[PDB]
């Protein structure tokens, strides 16, 4: 996105649909190299106090498309917009909208014309693919092949006898010892050769690489299964009541309101609380395991704070497995090490203080000519190109 | 054919609006999303000058002449401006227009917003900056368009190059035909000379071509007349140089020495106490630009430019 | 990467150049980031695997899990040329060559049929399309089936060890060339001279393949220059005159019409399109001081060209979309390039007798020369016999000088494109 003409079309649409947020890129959590952990809980929240945020919320996080609801007063009314600036216009109208009044009916609606909602549809199937590719099935497969090749194969056998042949043993140790030029000088060309290779050739846990093998199967079961859409809203972003006025809600905690689902709600004051409460609080996200759930989300208990993130995501191992592929754990020291959310944190934080002052127009105003919101939108856009260049595996 | 020839020129957008109508909102969305175009904004001028709002007439008159060198600089360049309109005053309305519209297809955009969503952005604005405009001065403005609002349409006016006819003063034609040639700069190549030590001024490199015109006019009725400002001390410095090339003239006039006014005023006022009345005029061949503005433009003779002036 | 090699032969392996007594039947050798194994699982089998560790075969820029390293035709080209090398010799050299440890030669041992099977293989492409392979048309021994979208596993068959095992690399270079891997795709610099030979060590592959090389595989005129020969030698011995170009044959068209025309009169550029011949004229080393003038019927051009306009071109274009608007008196060189084949003959006579009639030095049209479209995989499409007679109807009494010649490719005398240059 940066043709002129094509953003200004968008921005254009955006007025007219009378879209008023537009939601963040969320940062995983900071690797906590300490913990062997590439997303760390503790390392999330530890953040979040020495920057003076002392009261925070931890929701589940359940694998599905974000979505705003737009959720008017009389309920044909309501539709939903996108993790990008846009009216979810295709969809079967009556069957959302029979999935939105179990919500609906959980306020009172008097003299409130419409209240904007941040809720996860469900599953990612209904809306767009978000992990499927033509070529994920591909990845898939060509690892179960080479699995079932190698289960049922001489050659892991061989080798492993091999290796234990007198004459590679003692070559092995010492090419520990030798500098190369050194062992050309006493083992033949074609010895080096032989001998290196089934030294360093990579032997793999066929059962842990299977078992991975079908977390990916899972996910492509569900993706082509008969699906009904099924919302789950997490926060109540703003208010327009009927005068014209309008709430800035600005509290994580509506989603006690518009949620049954648990949560943790904690509150810290001094760091060492945290430290001592901690050790609970990692035994509870250690429960958020399920096919349904992509991990945690710690977000601050104010929706809104300057210069603060939306929130951390913090993503169970088996969902990594499907971002990272099946080699993982196997490759854990060095992913962890690549690791970096600097940046990915910043686009986070600034794209979550753009949504603030996007809000803060009100239901009203929005419209074609209001160029205050057309400039909120292309600055937000802008920004959306540039956190598009980072790790996409975050 | 020429209809189908056409040629095309750069925009000019101006904002016409009330202090707080969002004109400048505008146009910082304006001049991302579109494409070859630059904003000039009194304001920042006054930012550079360190006031924060409204200053010294001193001040002010000189930003003016800056923004207008700054808006046409950019229009002759083929690149687009954005401005904000100065007020609303139909008639400094209209002195932009004039200003610019030699170079630029001009077009408006008016933001017309009621008068107490006015004051409503300018106290949400006027805690913001330090700037403040009270709920006086913004309706001198408010109802001050929606009176020019109403004896003008905003409609987009295409360049106007108004082609000023020329057209000569009336003389006298019974009088005897005569052409006036300056010295330093024209029929006199000064070449490295000091301008206004003209002491040493009878080595100096003719002007070839300039010379062949005096030298063809006076073969026939025309009588040569050199008006040069140079001061009359350096006379013979001067019809050493003429004599020389065979420059012969009929009439040689010069700047009283000590004198030392503009060199165009001491021509006009030559050339009315020793030629007006006694002359007819062919046309003129001078250098310098002030001193040939003052010839066409203050008394209308055809003079003709012989090589770059601006000094 | 997956490899099963299947005959029945008792020496199959002795054809492999690899020992089934030597540490198990195990040959080992590191390919990249990287163990390539080979193994003697019989006297009748050998199996080829290949262990990536990361970023073996797709860089680690883009940021895919990743998996060409399971799949990709180029672990195939370079198990071949590891493992196999003598098993992709010259085609007369490998057959009078001997087998160490036979005293026989591989003329007298490798005379048992041969399976290939590939357990999985990436073909990103046109060329494999609705569980079609493209070269299953032409090599009959190509046996597809399909695993998933771009992946499929393949079975290669063979008289021959030699046979099949040179049919496998075919099939490797030409599905690796095709293909496309992303924003990271790259022919280095050095693929055309390692794997050239391929396309030429089994018999009747068609002139399109070589196409494609040295347009997707070959950098360089001069690594070109040394392939060449090694090509047109290929196709002499299946009957064909073939001459390779190494630009494109747009192209060859617009050096030739730049060459011929030259600078010094004004363009008029009929069916002008996106002005790619307006650009060229344009190079500043070429120093155009004209007009130049363009139309195009279609009036989408119309605006685009009327786009510029924008102060870009700066500035001697004048499009017209009217012909009653063309009113330059003085000569022009007149470009006809690929347009009176996207109308009516009859409208082509009109276009063509009324350029005649305009005031030109030089004009030349352009044609596709369907006898051409043979070798391959818009409103009509002449021969060139049928384009010299359109020719001959349109100059008709006139005195002019009228030189055919062909642009492109050129096989048995016939070339893509065909071309008039008209002289007054
Ligand atoms: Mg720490
Ligand atoms: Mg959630
Ligand atoms: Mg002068």
Redesign the pocket.
């Given at each position: 996105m940066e043709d002129k003409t094509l953003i200004k079309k968008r921005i254009d649409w955006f007025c007219k649909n009378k879209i008023n947020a537009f939601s963040p890129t969320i940062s995983p959590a900071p690797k906590s190299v300490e913990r062997n952990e590439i997303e760390s809980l503790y390392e999330g929240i530890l953040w979040f106090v020495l920057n003076g945020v002392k009261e925070i919320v931890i929701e589940k996080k359940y694998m599905g498309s974000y979505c705003d609801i737009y959720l008017h007063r009389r309920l044909e009314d309501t539709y939903l917009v996108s993790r990008n600036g846009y009216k979810i216009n295709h969809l079967d109208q009556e069957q959302c909208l029979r999935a939105l009044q179990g919500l609906h009916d959980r306020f009172s609606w008097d003299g409130v014309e419409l209240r904007i909602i941040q809720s996860e549809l469900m599953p990612w199937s209904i809306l767009g693919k978000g992990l499927i590719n033509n070529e994920f099935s591909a990845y898939y497969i060509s690892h179960e092949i080479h699995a079932e090749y190698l289960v049922q194969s001489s050659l892991y056998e061989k080798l492993q006898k091999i290796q234990q042949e007198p004459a590679y043993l003692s070559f092995v140790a010492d090419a520990k010892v030798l500098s190369a030029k050194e062992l050309k000088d006493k083992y033949p060309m074609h010895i080096i050769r032989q001998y290196q290779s089934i030294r360093d050739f990579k032997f793999l846990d066929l059962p842990h690489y299977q078992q991975n093998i079908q977390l990916f199967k899972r996910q492509l079961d569900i993706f082509g299964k008969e699906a009904a859409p099924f919302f789950k809203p997490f926060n109540i972003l703003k208010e327009v009541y009927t005068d014209g006025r309008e709430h800035f809600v600005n509290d994580n905690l509506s989603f006690q309101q518009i949620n049954d689902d648990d949560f943790l709600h904690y509150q810290f004051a001094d760091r060492e609380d945290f430290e001592a409460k901690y050790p609970q609080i990692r035994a509870w996200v250690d429960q958020v395991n399920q096919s349904d759930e992509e991990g945690v989300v710690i977000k601050p208990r104010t929706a809104f704070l300057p210069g603060m993130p939306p929130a951390f995501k913090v993503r169970n191992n088996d969902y990594l497995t499907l971002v990272y592929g099946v080699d993982f754990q196997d490759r854990l020291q060095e992913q962890i090490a690549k690791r970096n959310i600097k940046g990915k944190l910043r686009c986070s934080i600034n794209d979550w203080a753009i949504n603030a002052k996007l809000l803060a127009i009100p239901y009203s105003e929005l419209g074609e000519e209001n160029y205050e919101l057309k400039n909120l939108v292309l600055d937000r856009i802008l920004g959306e190109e540039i956190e598009n260049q980072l790790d996409s595996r975050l | 054919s020429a209809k189908n020839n056409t040629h095309h020129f750069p925009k000019l957008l101006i904002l016409v609006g009330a202090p707080g109508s969002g004109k400048s909102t505008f146009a910082r969305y304006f001049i991302r999303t579109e494409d070859n175009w630059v904003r000039v904004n009194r304001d920042d001028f006054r930012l550079m000058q360190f006031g924060d709002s409204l200053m010294s007439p001193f001040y002010e008159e000189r930003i003016t002449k800056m923004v207008e060198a700054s808006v046409i600089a950019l229009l002759k360049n083929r690149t687009n401006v954005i401005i904000d309109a100065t007020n609303s005053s139909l008639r400094s309305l209209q002195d932009m227009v004039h200003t610019y519209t030699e170079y630029a297809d001009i077009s408006f955009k008016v933001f017309d917003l009621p008068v107490e969503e006015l004051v409503k952005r300018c106290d949400k604005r006027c805690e913001q900056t330090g700037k403040f405009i009270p709920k006086s001065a913004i309706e001198k403005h408010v109802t001050q368009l929606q009176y020019t609002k109403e004896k003008f349409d905003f409609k987009p006016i295409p360049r106007a190059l108004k082609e000023t006819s020329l057209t000569y003063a009336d003389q006298d034609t019974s009088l005897p035909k005569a052409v006036i040639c300056?010295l330093?700069?024209?029929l006199s190549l000064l070449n490295g000379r000091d301008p206004y030590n003209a002491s040493t001024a009878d080595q100096d490199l003719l002007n070839t071509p300039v010379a062949m015109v005096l030298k063809m006019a006076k073969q026939q009725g025309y009588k040569v007349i050199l008006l040069s400002?140079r001061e009359n001390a350096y006379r013979e410095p001067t019809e050493r140089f003429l004599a020389k090339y065979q420059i012969d003239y009929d009439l040689l006039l010069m700047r009283d020495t000590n004198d030392y006014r503009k060199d165009n005023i001491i021509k006009k006022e030559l050339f009315l106490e020793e030629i007006q009345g006694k002359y007819f005029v062919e046309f003129l061949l001078?250098?310098?630009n002030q001193?040939v503005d003052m010839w066409r433009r203050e008394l209308a003779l055809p003079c003709f430019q012989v090589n770059y002036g601006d000094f | 990467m997956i490899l099963q090699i299947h005959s029945q032969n008792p020496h199959l392996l002795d054809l492999l150049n690899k020992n089934p007594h030597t540490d198990l039947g195990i040959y080992a050798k590191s390919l990249r980031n990287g163990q390539l194994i080979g193994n003697a699982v019989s006297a009748y089998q050998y199996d080829v695997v290949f262990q990536d560790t990361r970023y073996s075969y797709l860089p680690e820029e883009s940021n895919q899990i990743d998996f060409q390293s399971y799949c990709s035709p180029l672990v195939i080209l370079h198990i071949c040329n590891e493992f196999f090398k003598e098993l992709l010799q010259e085609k007369q050299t490998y057959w009078s060559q001997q087998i160490k440890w036979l005293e026989r030669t591989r003329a007298e041992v490798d005379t048992y049929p041969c399976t290939i099977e590939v357990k999985n293989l990436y073909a990103n492409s046109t060329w494999y399309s609705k569980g079609h392979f493209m070269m299953e048309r032409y090599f009959k021994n190509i046996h597809i089936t399909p695993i998933v979208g771009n992946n499929l596993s393949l079975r290669v068959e063979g008289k021959s060890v030699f046979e099949a095992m040179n049919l496998l690399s075919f099939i490797a270079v030409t599905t690796h060339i095709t293909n496309t891997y992303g924003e990271y795709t790259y022919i280095d610099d050095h693929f055309a001279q390692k794997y050239a030979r391929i396309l030429t060590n089994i018999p009747q592959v068609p002139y399109f393949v070589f196409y494609l090389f040295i347009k997707r595989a070959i950098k360089s005129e001069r690594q070109f220059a040394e392939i060449k020969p090694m090509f047109e030698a290929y196709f002499k011995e299946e009957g064909l005159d073939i001459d390779f170009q190494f630009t494109d044959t747009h192209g060859s068209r617009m050096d030739f019409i730049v060459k011929e025309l030259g600078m010094e009169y004004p363009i008029l550029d009929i069916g002008c399109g996106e002005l790619k011949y307006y650009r060229r004229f344009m190079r500043r080393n070429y120093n155009y001081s004209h007009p130049y003038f363009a139309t195009d019927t279609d009036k989408s051009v119309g605006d685009y060209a009327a786009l510029l306009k924008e102060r870009m071109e700066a500035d001697n274009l004048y499009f017209f979309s009217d012909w009653t608007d063309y009113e330059y008196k003085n000569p022009v060189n007149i470009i006809l390039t690929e347009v009176i084949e996207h109308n009516t003959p009859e409208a082509a006579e009109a276009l063509v007798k009324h350029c005649l009639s305009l005031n030109f030095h030089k004009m030349i049209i352009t044609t596709p020369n369907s006898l051409f479209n043979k070798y391959y995989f818009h409103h009509f499409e002449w021969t060139p016999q049928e384009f010299q007679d359109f020719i001959r109807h349109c100059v008709g009494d006139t005195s002019l000088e009228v030189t055919y010649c062909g642009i492109g490719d050129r096989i048995n005398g016939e070339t893509p494109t065909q071309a008039v240059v008209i002289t007054r």
């Open positions: - | 300056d330093d700069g024209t400002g001078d250098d310098r001193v | -």
